[PDB]
Amino acid sequence: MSVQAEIGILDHVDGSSEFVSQDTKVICSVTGPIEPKARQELPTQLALEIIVRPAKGVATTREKVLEDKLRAVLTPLITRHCYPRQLCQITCQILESGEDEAEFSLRELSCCINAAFLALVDAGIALNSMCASIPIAIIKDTSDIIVDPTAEQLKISLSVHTLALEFVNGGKVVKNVLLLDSNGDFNEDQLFSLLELGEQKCQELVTNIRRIIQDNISPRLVV
Amino acid sequence: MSRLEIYSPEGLRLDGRRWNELRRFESSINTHPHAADGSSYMEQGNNKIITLVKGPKEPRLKSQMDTSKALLNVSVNITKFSKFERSKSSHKNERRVLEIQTSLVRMFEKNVMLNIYPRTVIDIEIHVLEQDGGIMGSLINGITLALIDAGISMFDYISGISVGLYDTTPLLDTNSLEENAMSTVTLGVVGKSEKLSLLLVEDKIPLDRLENVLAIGIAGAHRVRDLMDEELRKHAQKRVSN
Amino acid sequence: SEVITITKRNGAFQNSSDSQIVTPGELVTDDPIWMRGHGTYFLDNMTYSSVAGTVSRVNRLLSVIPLKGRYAPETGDHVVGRIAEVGNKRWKVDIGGKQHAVLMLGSVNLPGGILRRKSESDELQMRSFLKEGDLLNAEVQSLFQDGSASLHTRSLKYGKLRNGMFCQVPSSLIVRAKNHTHNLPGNITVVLGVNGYIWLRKTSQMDLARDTESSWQIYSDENDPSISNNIRQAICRYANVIKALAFCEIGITQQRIVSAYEASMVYSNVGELIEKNVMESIGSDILTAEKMRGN
Amino acid sequence: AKDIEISASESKFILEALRQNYRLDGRSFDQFRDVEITFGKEFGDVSVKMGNTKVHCRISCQIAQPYEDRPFEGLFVISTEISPMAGSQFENGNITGEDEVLCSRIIEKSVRRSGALDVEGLCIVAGSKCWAVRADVHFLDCDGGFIDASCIAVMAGLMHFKKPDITVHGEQIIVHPVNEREPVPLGILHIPICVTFSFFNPQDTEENIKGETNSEISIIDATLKEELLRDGVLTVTLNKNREVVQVSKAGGLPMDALTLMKCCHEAYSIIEKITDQILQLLKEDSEKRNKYAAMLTSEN
Amino acid sequence: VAIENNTLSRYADAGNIDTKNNILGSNVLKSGKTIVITSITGGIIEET
Amino acid sequence: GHMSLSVAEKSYLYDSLASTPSIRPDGRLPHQFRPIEIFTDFLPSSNGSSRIIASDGSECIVSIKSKVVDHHVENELLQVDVDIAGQRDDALVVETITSLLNKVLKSGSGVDSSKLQLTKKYSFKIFVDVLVISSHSHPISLISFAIYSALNSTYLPKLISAFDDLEVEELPTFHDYDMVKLDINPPLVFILAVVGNNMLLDPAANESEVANNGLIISWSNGKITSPIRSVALNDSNVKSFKPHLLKQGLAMVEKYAPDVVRSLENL
Amino acid sequence: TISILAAPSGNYKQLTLMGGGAKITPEMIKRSLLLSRVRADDLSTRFNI
Amino acid sequence: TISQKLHDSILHSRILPKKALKVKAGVRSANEDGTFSVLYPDELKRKWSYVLYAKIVVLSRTGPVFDLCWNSLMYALQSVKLPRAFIDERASDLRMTIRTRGRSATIRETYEIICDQTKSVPLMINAKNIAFASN
Amino acid sequence: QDRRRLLGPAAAKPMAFSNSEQELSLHTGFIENCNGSALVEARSLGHQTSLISAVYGPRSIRGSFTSQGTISIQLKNGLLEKYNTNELKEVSSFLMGIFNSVVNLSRYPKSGIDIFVYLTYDKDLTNSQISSLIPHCITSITLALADAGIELVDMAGAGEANGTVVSFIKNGEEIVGFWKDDGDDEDLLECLDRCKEQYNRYRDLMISCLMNQ
Amino acid sequence: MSTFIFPGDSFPVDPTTPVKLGPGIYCDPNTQEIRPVNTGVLHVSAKGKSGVQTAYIDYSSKRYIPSVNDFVIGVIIGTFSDSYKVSLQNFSSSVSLSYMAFPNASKKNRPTLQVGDLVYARVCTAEKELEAEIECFDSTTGRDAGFGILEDGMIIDVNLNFARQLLFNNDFPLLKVLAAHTKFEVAIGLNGKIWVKCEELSNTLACYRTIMECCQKNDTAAFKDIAKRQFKEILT
RNA sequence: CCCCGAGAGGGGGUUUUUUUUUUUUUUUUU
Ligand SMILES: [Br-]
Ligand SMILES: [Br-]
Ligand SMILES: [Br-]
Ligand SMILES: [Br-]
Ligand SMILES: [Br-]
């Protein structure tokens, strides 16, 4: 869980970030609230334009799924009723997969969730709570539950998991499970053991994120 | 390595012209009165180009309307039968064609007085019937003639020309065979000036030869301007005399 | 040529107080005293031409009149136009210029006229008066900054057109005059819009009273239920001869039209007037007729 | 689309500053921005930075079959899709816009068409199997000079990239992993570098068309603000061999021919410094990877 | 859920195999008010 | 349709055309065509070419190019490509006319494809490219006249090598200069307008707007042939028609077509 | 919402949890997993394919 | 997105092993009396593989429809029959020589694989892995 | 290949293999997604056809203003037999002309009626074929429009005989569309009679379906 | 070191105390709970302030959201029938400036402002679900309260925090260190726009470069040195 | 500013494509 992030790296965007976990590096940008296109307009709430760009090649249907899952996480996080008939552009440029993209998209999705959240924080957009996402995998023979698995570990995995939780009260109370994307062969006992260990590492991540956010933003503000 | 005499020791080319001779240049004004406000049929060598200027007129969509200037649009239709070998696919959305259309617009935006036609649209439709080298230069001459026929105000003529560079020998007005055998430079000269509206080099050219090539092109473009101006005054006299 | 006249040609894409002609970029004068008008542009003392046309000098106003260009609406012109669109409290009508002309709701005569009380439902029911496609007479009331025209039909002379057929000629062939509505032999009436838009209809009572319950039906699409074939065949003939005059670049006037109409009587079938050689000769006969009648 | 509103005051100020030999960033009219090149862990990963302008290029390749027309040549494509990340002025996926198609065509004529990459050396077995090299440019942050930044990003990437070594047994392709044997670099025939000039008319159009003395201002490598207020653009591509790879002045402000020639000669001094700079950063990157390989084997 | 398998396939009738059909397998499924029609076709590729 | 007319103008035109003595707005008779101009052999790059100009400014350009193909794998030996200026390639009008024209000029329907055969294996594929610069009505008949003119002035390369690829199998080689004129019988496509109980040949723009229906009738070898299609010239005044009108239209074409061909057959 | 791909064997191949509204409790998950098995057993054996 | 999720979940649940798509290619020869016969190998040079495509038309949508697409796809996959494939014994078409600038090269002979009009083998699906959808 | 679909590997090549008068089935209103729908299945000799029609309208048209409604018809290829896009466009145009003579457009100002016909399953069992599908399309569209509640002047039906297709209304007295490909010479009268017989049968079954079902 | 707060965290103040909610703080319409939605420093006004305590969160942002009683710098980008269409920030929703929102206004005479002009104005209405409005006068007196056109000069982009400190904080040395180098007039907008104009362009340019760099570093005890090297560099 | 009205009223100032004469010893100075 030795992640590293930077905040406010882009000039022509309201907010930006760069999240890195092992070899997975994703840069994200957020502009909003701004004027929306007519087809995007929502009478009462904020409209989200979510874009995911791959590390190699052009955006395909694969990234279209990454956009959809990332939408399921960011939508309830943002206090959308504060911005009626308005738009918020959220763009994720995956710079380095950190995994075999021909087989997995686990680490890229988690890194996009964490980066998007950080970019939303930087942009100063109304959020109902905080959030953290981690990738989890289950190995073949050992059947151990490895949090933040490497690319080599994924190759020999039986199941891959993306867990993103919604935290409140100083990152101590799990408000809800924003996204759980479990793929592969697994049983009910493995699922809750995954959720128990997953919640712990997620809570540790929020604490680390809270540290990063305060370290970067506080110099900008005044005492 | 070319087995054909691109430039013989006698100073003669494959078509018979010398190094500094333009192809057969024949212009034609008011060719499609019932189809456009201005029209021109260009024959520069084997090149055959129909140019139609429609406007200034009401935009079809109020969303696309400028209250300070006219909207200038150019669409080049390179037909599938323009070359010897018929192209299977269309060129309508070809990136090469989009650049050509964009290029032509960027040329005449600074020549056509769009500011005196606010809230209007000028649509320029082009049909290339036959192609044989220097198609870009011929496109420029076709638009300039057609725009003038439409009575649309502009500051000056824009003449187009292409110049090839066979090793050390410059060749004015290149055909398809010469373009396939050497690098060419396309020029867009404004009026009788030395100012270039369009400088286009797509193949390798030594830095030392470029200035001389430009000098040849500008001189040749001035002759194209004279031919365009000549044919235009001729048509003017035949119409004003009735 | 019993059924179709097909002219053929091979090996060719197509057939192939002095007025000073100038082209774009050409230097017209170097006298800085001049006031530069349309068709020109200047830099210090030098005045250049922006279009291809003839140099015009009116007083101290130097301008270049283009050889070609769309109809330019002057204030007070009698034009014929078609409603292009209807919005808010105005119509936009196609005259044939660079821009659509506007026709405010307050610039027309509502049905029932002076007796009618003002209603706020008129602005929501404009389509019951003038809708898309309708033809009408109108006068260029005013001009906008760019040159656009504001129209009005505040007269019995102006209004929706019916009982006839539409045709158009280049606006250059129709000039301004004291009046553009004319009565012609055959009980038909022509409306020669300055914009080149022409309306040929059956002569109405108004057309007769011009030289010698109805206010509710001034916007009806319905035509005269009793229109004889002799009037219809007259309209067709007047239409063809007008197109013939236009084909020869001959300026259309009320005299030229009637003259051509009677001269075209040589040809039995009216459809004979659509052929090129017939059109050219009819126009040529008019010019030569004016030659030996003028001298 | 979404427009950038520029006040009359800003338009008049930036232009008047040019009339007083001043540009906002403090550069000179003939001064190119300092180009910073950063290589990632993987080969083909390169990040180019020019002031605030940030672009990232990624070189990748995969086994593919050559076209019927060219059985001896491999495949090579360059992607430069824009995104709202570089600014809300850009529409997502807008690959038909005027500026987009131009930029796409400049890069293509500078790298692809110019034959900067040896596509013949991308062939494994003639008319059957070959390498398909892909250059993906990612526009992160826009402050002008996207063409110049991309051309450097693509070239630096291609020269830094290394493809897996291959031994051939007839038609059986044995693709050696990086663990077994070392990867093989690409073949570069020449190193094309783009330099973009921006033109400004300090006076009016009349004095540009019929004016005696020329007074049009030309600056090298314009920022976003300077780019939005220019009247004409010129992109010239050269290499250390003193040859013009391509020149593109697609319309815009009419410019004197001798001035355009001056720009080409000025650009040549810049592309020389840039090319040598790229080569040096590649050497040091190679020395860094070798020094770590020695410290990894010694500790092993 | 109501389904019908292999009704669109060329191997529908083992006695009368269709000649101008390239469907290897199929399934027509209706659940409630929604209808789903699936057909499987095939291709062949050389392996190296 | 194309032309925009008011309700009054349409009513006047309809009554005038639906009259028992049918009155055309230009004074024509129900079988008279408007004057056209035709240019041929102006594209040296192509094997054949034509350009037709109507009286209303309607203009169409046809080009004819050839290509040697294996007729054992290439079923269609004549491909028509239609491009209407101002319309998308996938427009409804474009594809319909394209599909229609390809049926009119099929290999074994209205065209002697024997004249395209070179050897026992190879034949000449003919590409008929249509470019409609301007048109104010259904250009199907306009294009047809141009294709006719173009195909009657087309010159193809002449074969030199033997014509038996089954045995000796010689590579198709052609003479360096001589070209044989393409002897073929191009079909014609006539379009009719139905206004009330009257049938008009060569419908004008204003006429088509008020028409109740229309007919597209092909013509080849001195007789009526498929494709025959009823067509709505407009979409606001389309009505069903009595069968006798359909038989009247076929009869009308059957007697006036040779007159058109005669004026068109002049070299 | 909860989406499940359950194999009749008793194991699971896909489990999507999207909690944007009410809180997803372990009881809700367990009940969903139970119903997914019951549904899977029905769909697999019904049409004897 | 539905197309992707269907594609991925088939790969993740491990329904279709690559071995189950391997083409056991036979050989068609010209026997006596002028007839063609095909000989297929069993339980044992060029190698081919089957590729499966799917078209899923959804009519009368009333809500989330992924689950219906998956269950339909599962039912369809259990009915898939793979056609027998064979090549001609000695097809005349051999290598194609292509010349370079002085040196010569030969493009490998491409064998035209043909599917049997009648004979077919059932798809080998890991029935233990077939899951069904519910939301 | 395509960035919006999964078309698989490019080196893959499609599998090529070696070597009463009519039976009808009609159903309406089974698609809740739209306003009107119909299922038309026909089986005869060595060719069966199962096509589905769907009517969407009257819905909004945000452009200018129109006193009457605007009809659009689009044919889509099904699973089995494919057709040229041009040929499907041509039939669409032919169908538009027919229903612009039947649909009471005056009752739907500034509205759009979009009619879709899915050529779902067209089997060719013979161990321009589009001409034999045309009468079934008209039957489906007529059923769907009537099921949608769109006003019709009369039940439009059709018939096919030797490549000739002709659609009738008003008890076969008048013709709303005429189509002819290939066929023979001077066979117009025979085709009209044979098609009117099919038109009459189809119309009876359609009315029987719209009523009893 | 400061007291940072994050979204979802518990709100310190008790419901028993009447609290006026400012930026960053959100009152849920459904559950009636008061909760922070922005990330930054929580500021709570001292008690005794007329019995009402004002609590808000100072958070970093650069995208302006119109609020009533704000001095902003807009640019005229359009002219409607009764008002101007004005942009306060790129890509943001346009704001309206009425023709009657000027001193000495009349239905007969429209203002002479042309498209492309800079205007210093006050936000009069800022409804969340409606186009905001600005005015260039005092609604009560009718005079111009320093509002109106900004002739020439140069405009500067700046984050909302830097602009707010420049307008409300007198301890901000920026205006002082610039006055120690040259004479200049300045308009400050809460929408993150700063207008600067001197007698000579070189001085305005020098001011532009200083404000840009000072906004970038955000180190107060470095403004004087930045201004020093900037005005020096212009002299070269 | 412009239009309209015997009486400071009203209407407007426009929203990927013309690229292929094939043969028997290292190194250095000649
Ligand atoms: Br106008
Ligand atoms: Br090659
Ligand atoms: Br700058
Ligand atoms: Br005949
Ligand atoms: Br794929």
mmCIF file with all atom_site columns, C-alpha atoms in Angstrom, chain B residues 13-72:
data_model
loop_
_atom_site.group_PDB
_atom_site.id
_atom_site.type_symbol
_atom_site.label_atom_id
_atom_site.label_alt_id
_atom_site.label_comp_id
_atom_site.label_asym_id
_atom_site.label_entity_id
_atom_site.label_seq_id
_atom_site.pdbx_PDB_ins_code
_atom_site.Cartn_x
_atom_site.Cartn_y
_atom_site.Cartn_z
_atom_site.occupancy
_atom_site.B_iso_or_equiv
_atom_site.pdbx_formal_charge
_atom_site.auth_seq_id
_atom_site.auth_comp_id
_atom_site.auth_asym_id
_atom_site.auth_atom_id
_atom_site.pdbx_PDB_model_num
ATOM 1  C CA . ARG B 1 13 ? 11.100  17.471 -70.792 1.00 0.00 ? 13 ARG B CA 1
ATOM 2  C CA . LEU B 1 14 ? 8.913   14.390 -71.312 1.00 0.00 ? 14 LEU B CA 1
ATOM 3  C CA . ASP B 1 15 ? 6.003   16.485 -72.586 1.00 0.00 ? 15 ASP B CA 1
ATOM 4  C CA . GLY B 1 16 ? 8.167   18.793 -74.686 1.00 0.00 ? 16 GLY B CA 1
ATOM 5  C CA . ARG B 1 17 ? 8.222   21.853 -72.435 1.00 0.00 ? 17 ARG B CA 1
ATOM 6  C CA . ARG B 1 18 ? 11.426  23.484 -71.232 1.00 0.00 ? 18 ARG B CA 1
ATOM 7  C CA . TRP B 1 19 ? 12.399  24.016 -67.592 1.00 0.00 ? 19 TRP B CA 1
ATOM 8  C CA . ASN B 1 20 ? 10.562  27.332 -67.211 1.00 0.00 ? 20 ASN B CA 1
ATOM 9  C CA . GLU B 1 21 ? 7.364   26.868 -69.235 1.00 0.00 ? 21 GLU B CA 1
ATOM 10 C CA . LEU B 1 22 ? 3.820   26.657 -67.860 1.00 0.00 ? 22 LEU B CA 1
ATOM 11 C CA . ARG B 1 23 ? 1.313   24.123 -69.179 1.00 0.00 ? 23 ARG B CA 1
ATOM 12 C CA . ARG B 1 24 ? -1.693  25.049 -71.312 1.00 0.00 ? 24 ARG B CA 1
ATOM 13 C CA . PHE B 1 25 ? -3.657  27.483 -69.153 1.00 0.00 ? 25 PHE B CA 1
ATOM 14 C CA . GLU B 1 26 ? -7.290  28.038 -70.122 1.00 0.00 ? 26 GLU B CA 1
ATOM 15 C CA . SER B 1 27 ? -9.752  29.701 -67.759 1.00 0.00 ? 27 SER B CA 1
ATOM 16 C CA . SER B 1 28 ? -13.529 29.966 -68.033 1.00 0.00 ? 28 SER B CA 1
ATOM 17 C CA . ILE B 1 29 ? -15.914 32.240 -66.131 1.00 0.00 ? 29 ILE B CA 1
ATOM 18 C CA . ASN B 1 30 ? -19.691 32.011 -65.563 1.00 0.00 ? 30 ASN B CA 1
ATOM 19 C CA . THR B 1 31 ? -19.927 28.338 -66.502 1.00 0.00 ? 31 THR B CA 1
ATOM 20 C CA . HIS B 1 32 ? -22.739 27.449 -64.100 1.00 0.00 ? 32 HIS B CA 1
ATOM 21 C CA . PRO B 1 33 ? -25.054 30.486 -63.734 1.00 0.00 ? 33 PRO B CA 1
ATOM 22 C CA . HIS B 1 34 ? -28.091 28.441 -62.683 1.00 0.00 ? 34 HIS B CA 1
ATOM 23 C CA . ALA B 1 35 ? -26.137 26.491 -60.065 1.00 0.00 ? 35 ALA B CA 1
ATOM 24 C CA . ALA B 1 36 ? -24.057 29.136 -58.285 1.00 0.00 ? 36 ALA B CA 1
ATOM 25 C CA . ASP B 1 37 ? -23.553 32.878 -57.824 1.00 0.00 ? 37 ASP B CA 1
ATOM 26 C CA . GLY B 1 38 ? -20.035 32.433 -59.172 1.00 0.00 ? 38 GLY B CA 1
ATOM 27 C CA . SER B 1 39 ? -18.459 29.638 -61.193 1.00 0.00 ? 39 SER B CA 1
ATOM 28 C CA . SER B 1 40 ? -15.221 28.768 -62.976 1.00 0.00 ? 40 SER B CA 1
ATOM 29 C CA . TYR B 1 41 ? -13.986 25.900 -65.140 1.00 0.00 ? 41 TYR B CA 1
ATOM 30 C CA . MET B 1 42 ? -10.215 25.466 -64.964 1.00 0.00 ? 42 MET B CA 1
ATOM 31 C CA . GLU B 1 43 ? -8.012  23.666 -67.474 1.00 0.00 ? 43 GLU B CA 1
ATOM 32 C CA . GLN B 1 44 ? -4.355  23.758 -66.462 1.00 0.00 ? 44 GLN B CA 1
ATOM 33 C CA . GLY B 1 45 ? -2.707  20.986 -68.445 1.00 0.00 ? 45 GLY B CA 1
ATOM 34 C CA . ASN B 1 46 ? -4.774  17.813 -68.223 1.00 0.00 ? 46 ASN B CA 1
ATOM 35 C CA . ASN B 1 47 ? -6.214  19.125 -64.951 1.00 0.00 ? 47 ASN B CA 1
ATOM 36 C CA . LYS B 1 48 ? -9.961  19.769 -65.116 1.00 0.00 ? 48 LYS B CA 1
ATOM 37 C CA . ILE B 1 49 ? -11.670 21.580 -62.243 1.00 0.00 ? 49 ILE B CA 1
ATOM 38 C CA . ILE B 1 50 ? -15.215 22.837 -61.735 1.00 0.00 ? 50 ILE B CA 1
ATOM 39 C CA . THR B 1 51 ? -15.525 25.482 -59.016 1.00 0.00 ? 51 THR B CA 1
ATOM 40 C CA . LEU B 1 52 ? -18.836 26.729 -57.629 1.00 0.00 ? 52 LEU B CA 1
ATOM 41 C CA . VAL B 1 53 ? -19.305 29.684 -55.288 1.00 0.00 ? 53 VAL B CA 1
ATOM 42 C CA . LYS B 1 54 ? -22.682 29.748 -53.555 1.00 0.00 ? 54 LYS B CA 1
ATOM 43 C CA . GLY B 1 55 ? -23.293 32.928 -51.576 1.00 0.00 ? 55 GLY B CA 1
ATOM 44 C CA . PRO B 1 56 ? -23.275 35.108 -49.643 1.00 0.00 ? 56 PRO B CA 1
ATOM 45 C CA . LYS B 1 57 ? -26.580 33.680 -48.415 1.00 0.00 ? 57 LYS B CA 1
ATOM 46 C CA . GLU B 1 58 ? -28.553 32.723 -45.306 1.00 0.00 ? 58 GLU B CA 1
ATOM 47 C CA . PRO B 1 59 ? -26.981 29.977 -43.158 1.00 0.00 ? 59 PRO B CA 1
ATOM 48 C CA . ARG B 1 60 ? -29.039 26.778 -43.034 1.00 0.00 ? 60 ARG B CA 1
ATOM 49 C CA . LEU B 1 61 ? -28.576 26.645 -39.260 1.00 0.00 ? 61 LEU B CA 1
ATOM 50 C CA . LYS B 1 62 ? -28.786 29.722 -37.025 1.00 0.00 ? 62 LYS B CA 1
ATOM 51 C CA . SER B 1 63 ? -26.446 27.971 -34.589 1.00 0.00 ? 63 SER B CA 1
ATOM 52 C CA . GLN B 1 64 ? -23.654 28.420 -37.125 1.00 0.00 ? 64 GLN B CA 1
ATOM 53 C CA . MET B 1 65 ? -23.880 32.178 -37.677 1.00 0.00 ? 65 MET B CA 1
ATOM 54 C CA . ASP B 1 66 ? -21.348 34.960 -37.138 1.00 0.00 ? 66 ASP B CA 1
ATOM 55 C CA . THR B 1 67 ? -22.618 38.513 -36.653 1.00 0.00 ? 67 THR B CA 1
ATOM 56 C CA . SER B 1 68 ? -19.221 40.032 -37.453 1.00 0.00 ? 68 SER B CA 1
ATOM 57 C CA . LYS B 1 69 ? -18.220 38.103 -40.575 1.00 0.00 ? 69 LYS B CA 1
ATOM 58 C CA . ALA B 1 70 ? -19.358 35.603 -43.200 1.00 0.00 ? 70 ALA B CA 1
ATOM 59 C CA . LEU B 1 71 ? -18.726 31.878 -42.800 1.00 0.00 ? 71 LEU B CA 1
ATOM 60 C CA . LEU B 1 72 ? -16.389 30.531 -45.478 1.00 0.00 ? 72 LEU B CA 1
#
